[PDB]
Amino acid sequence: STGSATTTPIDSLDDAYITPVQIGTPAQTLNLDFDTGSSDLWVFSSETTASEVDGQTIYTPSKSTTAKLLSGATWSISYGDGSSSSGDVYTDTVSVGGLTVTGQAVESAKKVSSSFTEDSTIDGLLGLAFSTLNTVSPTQQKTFFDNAKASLDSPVFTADLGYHAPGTYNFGFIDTTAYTGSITYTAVSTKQGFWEWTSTGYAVGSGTFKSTSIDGIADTGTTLLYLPATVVSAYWAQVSGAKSSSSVGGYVFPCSATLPSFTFGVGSARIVIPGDYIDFGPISTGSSSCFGGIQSSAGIGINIFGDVALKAAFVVFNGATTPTLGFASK
DSSP: OOEEEEEEESTTTOOOEEEEEEEEETTTEEEEEEEOOOOOOOOOOSSSSSGGGGSOOBBBBGTTTTEEEEEEEEEEEEEESSSSEEEEEEEEEEEETTTEEEEEEEEEEEEEOHHHHTTTTTEEEEEEEEEGOOOSSSSSSOHHHHGGGGGSSSSEEEEOOSSSSSSEESSSOOOTTTSOOOOEEOOBBOSSSOOEEEEEEEETTTTOEEEEEEEEEETTOOOEEEOOOOHHHHTTTTTTTTTTTTTTTTTEETTTTOOOOOEETTEEEEEEEEEEGGEEEESTTSSEEEEEEEOTTOOOOOHEOOOHHHHHHHHEEOOOSSSSEEEEEO
């Protein structure tokens, strides 16, 4: 089997991407944030504290003839951005782009933090990291991908995120028309539960490539590119007037600037992030100070190849017995 679904930016900055997901019988379609940096499929629901729901579409398990309470199961998650959610668990039928899993754990939110409530466009998350990170207790649950894997034509999914445009998540096949050149594959460590890999280096603009190992995670659920302070300083030094602002919480730059590209290494291959992808617009409405899309990972504890980086590539998440990651230009 295979699946193919379009993923759409939630706003003009590509702050996140939502993908429609069918849950239950009859189908209830919710727009979920596909997150290769976590492993829970959780939704706004009829059980979510009413004051914490503001415009989201909710899953109502009592209206699904295939929903079953997973007795005794609870979940609770905190994300790197400080947001959180928790609740109980149902199993139900879940379909993405024509690919159907029966008995998928659907984690129903009883509580969500303010940042979720405040984002009316995201109805929940669909985790695509390794199932070892799933938070369901006392019986850990499998991700949608893990459940689908054996049925897929090939045990892979691909992320093709657009810049200020829709893109595609495919399951079970590699669309050879979706990228240019060849796909370069690189080793993955699953020791922390993430799609963790090592970039071979970087360049700023038309500058020379610096060969250096950068361990990080491929994370579709993180907006920006978070890299070591040395790398980030080298990037922003090429932008007149750019500075790290402790008050704003990262590098800012004059909105009048033209940003250089940023290249990262995948083996001997190179992925080029155009400068425009690194512009996240005014820090507040009407400001001439703009927020940068490359930020320091210092104090995160891990480097994160988030959407800024991934949307410059066609990315293969290869869930073979020994997983790997593939990157192609597009």
